[PDB]
Structure formats: structure tokens, C-alpha cells
Design a protein around this ligand. Sequence first.
Ligand SMILES: CCCCCCCC/C=C\CCCCCCCC(=O)O[C@@H](COC(=O)CCCCCCCCCCCCCCC)COP(=O)([O-])OCC[N+](C)(C)C
Ligand SMILES: CCCCCCCC/C=C\CCCCCCCC(=O)O[C@@H](COC(=O)CCCCCCCCCCCCCCC)COP(=O)([O-])OCC[N+](C)(C)C
Ligand SMILES: CC(C)CCC[C@@H](C)[C@H]1CC[C@H]2[C@@H]3CC=C4C[C@@H](O)CC[C@]4(C)[C@H]3CC[C@]12C
Ligand SMILES: CC(C)CCC[C@@H](C)[C@H]1CC[C@H]2[C@@H]3CC=C4C[C@@H](O)CC[C@]4(C)[C@H]3CC[C@]12C
Lengths: 196, 196
Amino acid sequence: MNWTGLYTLLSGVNRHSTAIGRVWLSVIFIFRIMVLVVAAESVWGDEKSSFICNTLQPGCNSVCYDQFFPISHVRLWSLQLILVSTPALLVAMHVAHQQHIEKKMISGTLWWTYVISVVFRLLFEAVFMYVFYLLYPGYAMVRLVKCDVYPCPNTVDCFVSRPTEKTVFTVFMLAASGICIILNVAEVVYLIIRAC
Amino acid sequence: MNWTGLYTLLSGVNRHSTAIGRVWLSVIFIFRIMVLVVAAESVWGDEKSSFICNTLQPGCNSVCYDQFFPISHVRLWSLQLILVSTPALLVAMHVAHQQHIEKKMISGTLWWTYVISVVFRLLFEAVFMYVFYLLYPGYAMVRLVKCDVYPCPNTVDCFVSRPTEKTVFTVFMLAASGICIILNVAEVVYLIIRAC
Ligand SMILES: CCCCCCCC/C=C\CCCCCCCC(=O)O[C@@H](COC(=O)CCCCCCCCCCCCCCC)COP(=O)([O-])OCC[N+](C)(C)C
Ligand SMILES: CCCCCCCC/C=C\CCCCCCCC(=O)O[C@@H](COC(=O)CCCCCCCCCCCCCCC)COP(=O)([O-])OCC[N+](C)(C)C
Ligand SMILES: CC(C)CCC[C@@H](C)[C@H]1CC[C@H]2[C@@H]3CC=C4C[C@@H](O)CC[C@]4(C)[C@H]3CC[C@]12C
Ligand SMILES: CC(C)CCC[C@@H](C)[C@H]1CC[C@H]2[C@@H]3CC=C4C[C@@H](O)CC[C@]4(C)[C@H]3CC[C@]12C
């Protein structure tokens, strides 16, 4: 493994991307992947097993955990990474297919599809940011929550596992997503300006 | 033990009480004593040991039981019986003392002290009825209670032991107390009418 191969793999074979999406976006993507890898198994490993409520009612822990955590942060970020990386994979596959078909026997089409893929990537980033805002208003996570879902009688106190570490990693991931959004917008603007 | 001795002991040596307070009040007193004896140990024996709340908080059962049962029905009725029987004991002791002092060496004084003792007995009956009404509004007892006393978090469901049997015995004791009140009022009225 060399640098000239890793850089080519990350950038794809596309020849229209500038240094914003070729030197900076790949680095932020690697940063997000590494943070998700080092945080998924350790911090969020026992989010449900150590989630306890102050009640004797059977089945209250599971219903309260599902009520307060419809989909955990780790899985939300994994889905966000997959959806954000899908258009880049599509562009790389399309470039490879065009190279194959020209070998066995255009620039504007590649430029347009790259612009469309960057727009879709920005749209996915914004959609996942909005979903995270809807599900979990506020970056901070609290230690104690009040759960009144059936079958829990009245309202019970349930305790979250590692609120502070999860808050730190949430801040990191949200900052990385914001940087990605800014870089995508800058890339779109630069391409439009240079094309005109 | 013969009837002519039990009747004399129950009525005392007082010669002013009519058949209302000599034949009927003693029977109702015996009825109340027997009901209290057969209900105190069995029905109310495990009122606190089997009082459970739906929570994991230590010490919530005791605080909730004390909140909802400041003083149990059995002890309230025992204190009521003792206080109601105190004036009769005082009258009997006074009659015995007068007999002793006249032997070693009046009717109006005995009549007045008997009337005063009956009035005090009626007052004690009314006071204990009012106290029971204040502490436990309504004869019926519920199975489930909502307890929000410290240290219990939020509101917890606590379960009472034998609500229906305790309701039945409460009805019996309240009916007996009402009959005693009516008989005391009738005795006072009869004495006042006959004296004038
Ligand atoms: C997302 C998770 C990240 C975790 C943190 C990772 C951080 C650290 C991880 C990785 C850092 C890199 C480690 C190896 C570096 C040596 C490379 C090398 O010598 O290349 C040379 C030889 O190499 C080859 O020909 C084969 C290259 C294999 C490298 C390892 C493959 C993946 C290992 C997966 C491990 C799985 C377990 C990992 C954990 C699950 C290059 O070939 P060459 O013939 O010299 O080139 C031509 C010669 N010429 C130039 C003179 C003309
Ligand atoms: C509040 C709780 C209530 C519970 C329900 C109770 C229901 C049932 C209970 C009780 C009913 C009565 C049982 C005994 C009746 C026999 C009486 C008798 O024969 O008397 C005779 C003899 O007797 C005596 O001389 C002594 C009397 C002792 C009686 C028992 C004393 C208390 C027992 C306590 C027990 C403790 C355990 C109880 C449970 C804790 C009378 O004497 P005599 O010499 O014949 O008289 C003169 C002779 N002449 C007439 C010919 C001139
Ligand atoms: C500018 C940034 C966004 C470019 C990022 C490039 C990403 C989307 C590309 C570069 C290399 C790609 C990987 C290359 C090889 C494989 C192995 C295959 O069995 C599953 C997909 C997987 C794991 C690809 C996933 C997508 C991937 C990680
Ligand atoms: C008209 C009605 C209210 C009269 C009722 C009479 C009551 C008050 C009298 C009759 C016999 C009495 C009992 C006779 C003997 C004793 C034994 C003594 O060591 C304690 C008190 C005790 C237990 C007395 C308590 C009061 C008593 C039960």
C-alpha cells in the first residue's frame, strides 16, 4: 500500500474534482470513519444492557429504551456515512464503466454527473443533520430521563449510560458533518464559477 | 362464673342507670370487644409486612405505609374502646369508694357524676368518629394507592392488604359506634326527662 494508490482510490478516477473534494473531503471522511470505529463498539456497546429504570415492572427497561432511543447515534452515523458515500461509489463505477466501454471499442456527461452526485451528497448530509435534530434536540445527553410508557406505572426514572462521553463524540461527529456540508457547498460553488 | 355476677360487673354497682345503659350498652360493648379480638390479629396482622410498592427504591414501602396509614384501624378502635370505657371505670371506682367510706363510718352526687360520665362517653364516641372520618374518608378501602412521598421517585403504585375484609369490619365497627352514640343520647334524654 502506497500513497499514490490510496489517494487514487479515495479520489476515484474522476478528473473534474478540485482539491476541495480530493484532498480535504477524503481526509474528513477518513476522520469520521476512524472516530466511528473507535466509538461504536466501546462507548455505545452497552447502551441497552446497562440502561436501568427504577421500577419492578417487567419489560419497562426495554420500552423506555426504545422510547428514548428510537435509533442509536452510532447506527444513525453509520447510515449517514453509507448514504453520503453512495454517490461517490456511483461516480467511480460510472467512470470505470465508461473507461471499459471506450477500451472495448463524454466530458460534459461526467461533469454533470459529478455535480449531481455532489448535490445529492450535500442533500443527504442536510437530511441526516435534520433527522438528528428532530430525534435528539440538543447535543448534550442527560443522565436521568422520565419514562411514562406502558407498561411502566406512572413515571419512572431511567438512567442513560455514559452521557458525557456520548456528548463528546456527538459534538465531534456533528462538527465533522458541518465541515463536510461546508466543503460540499464550496465545491459546488467553485465548479459553477469555473464553468462560467 | 354466673349471669348474676357478669351482669353486676358490667353494670357496676350504680343504681341510677336504666335498662338502656345496663342491658343494651353492655351487650354492644361485648360485641365490639369480640369483633375487635377476632379481627385485630388476623385481618390486620400483616397490614405492613404484605404492603408492597412497585419500585426498587429502598425505604419506599415504609414511608408510603406511614403516609397512607398514620394509625391503623385496629389501634384506633382499641383506643376508642379504652377511652369510652374509662368513665364507666371511674364511676364504678367512685361507687366502690363511697361504699367503703360509708362502711368504715349522696344520691344527687352519684346521679350527677353518672350523667357527666355518660356525657363524656358520648363526647369521646363523637370525637373518635370525627377522627376516623378525618383520617379515612369513606368506609371503603381501595386496593391501589398512589404514593409520592420521599424517597419514592415520582409516584409509585402501592397495594393494600385485604381491602374488602377491612371494609366489612370497618362497617361493623362504625355501625356499633353509631348504635352506642344513639343509646348514650337516649340514656341522657331519659335521665333528664325522668329527673324533671
Ligand atoms: C478502519 C480501521 C483502521 C485501523 C487502524 C489502521 C492503522 C494501521 C494500518 C495499516 C497501515 C499499513 C500497514 C502495512 C504497511 C506496509 C505496506 C507495504 O510495505 O507495501 C508494499 C508491499 O506491500 C504489499 O505489496 C502488500 C500491502 C499489504 C498491506 C496491508 C494490507 C491490509 C492489512 C489489513 C490489516 C487488518 C487489521 C487492521 C485492524 C482491523 C508496497 O508494495 P511494493 O512491492 O513495495 O511496491 C512496489 C515497489 N517499488 C515501490 C519499489 C516500485
Ligand atoms: C374476650 C375473649 C373471649 C373469648 C371467647 C370466650 C367464650 C367462652 C369462654 C368462657 C365461658 C365460660 C367457661 C367456664 C364456665 C364454667 C363456669 C362454672 O362452672 O362456674 C361455677 C364454678 O366456677 C368457678 O367457681 C370458677 C369459674 C371459672 C370460669 C373460667 C374463668 C375464666 C377462664 C378464662 C379462659 C381463658 C382462655 C379464653 C380465650 C383467651 C360457678 O361457681 P359455683 O360454685 O357453681 O357457684 C355457686 C354454687 N351454687 C350456684 C349452686 C350456689
Ligand atoms: C471524496 C470522498 C467522499 C471519497 C470516498 C470514497 C469511498 C466512497 C470509497 C473509496 C473506496 C471504496 C471501497 C473500496 C472497496 C470496497 C470493498 C467492497 O467489497 C465493498 C465496498 C468497499 C468497502 C468500497 C466502499 C466505498 C469506498 C470506501
Ligand atoms: C355500660 C358499659 C360501658 C360497662 C362496661 C364495663 C367495663 C368498662 C368494665 C367492666 C369490668 C372491667 C374490668 C374488670 C377488671 C379488670 C382487670 C384489671 O387488672 C384491668 C382492668 C379490667 C380489665 C377492667 C376494665 C374495665 C371493665 C371491662
